[PDB]
Amino acid sequence: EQREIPDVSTLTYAEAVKKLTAAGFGRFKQANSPSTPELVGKVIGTNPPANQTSAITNVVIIIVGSGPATKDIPDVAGQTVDVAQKNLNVYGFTKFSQASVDSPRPAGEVTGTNPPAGTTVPVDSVIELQVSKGNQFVMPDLSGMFWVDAEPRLRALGWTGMLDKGADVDAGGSQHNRVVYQNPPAGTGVNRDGIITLRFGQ
């Protein structure tokens, strides 16, 4: 017997089977398609489609939504905003928001994204970009250095700030006029105009 396929869209797979079964069909398969967030795990259509007449001895493909198309956010750190967005475009992302962040990276370079790289997000979702101010430098280790060598090394790194010389530290003759303690610690990101505290040996 031929019979018109009932519309089972928006239903769950199980309930779609029951309705198709009540119509006299008995052989089904599940296929998957991208869909709206509401239709996740829901039937979006069939093959043969709704209201199409068909034999009940034939298979009825029940197509179930899997939600919006997604993609892993690529890493764009170090890239300029212009380059990063175009590289994000090739993945399908077109919506962006930006915020300035304190960073030793050159001004304009992306430091990271929100959601971060490696995150799976919908293609039509918004990706926030953290953009370096280029206002920082990486603090070097100044241990054992004389100030006549220490200062130009800092100036070359972009430091335009002021020295806060603390009291001398009794650390022996081998440390005379040498940096014993420093702040901020080596490796930390330091604002260009930031205050550097040094304590030299007597």
Curated annotation (Swiss-Prot):
Overexpression causes major growth and morphological changes that indicate defects in cell wall synthesis and possibly in cell division. Autophosphorylated. Dephosphorylated by PstP. Residues 1-202 are extracellular. Disruption phenotype: Essential for growth, it cannot be disrupted. PknB depletion in M.tuberculosis results in cell death and aberrant cell morphology, and leads to complete clearance of the pathogen from the host tissues using the murine infection model. It is found in: Cell membrane. This is Serine/threonine-protein kinase PknB. Homodimer. Interacts with the FHA domain of GarA, FhaB and FhaA. Residues 1-66, 67-133, 134-202 form the PASTA domain. The chain holds residues 425 to 626 of 626 of the full protein. Protein kinase that regulates many aspects of mycobacterial physiology, and is critical for growth in vitro and survival of the pathogen in the host. Is a key component of a signal transduction pathway that regulates cell growth, cell shape and cell division via phosphorylation of target proteins such as GarA, GlmU, PapA5, FhaB (Rv0019c), FhaA (Rv0020c), MviN, PstP, EmbR, Rv1422, Rv1747, RseA and RmlA. Also catalyzes the phosphorylation of the core proteasome alpha-subunit (PrcA), and thereby regulates the proteolytic activity of the proteasome. It comes from the Bacteria. Coiled coil: none annotated. Belongs to the protein kinase superfamily. Ser/Thr protein kinase family. Induction: Expressed predominantly in exponential phase. PknB levels are regulated in response to hypoxia; its expression is down-regulated during hypoxia and recovers to aerated levels upon reaeration (at mRNA and protein level). The intracellular kinase domain and all four extracytoplasmic PASTA domains are essential for PknB function and cell survival. The PASTA domains interact with peptidoglycans and are required for PknB localization. The lineage of its organism: Bacteria, Bacillati, Actinomycetota, Actinomycetes, Mycobacteriales.
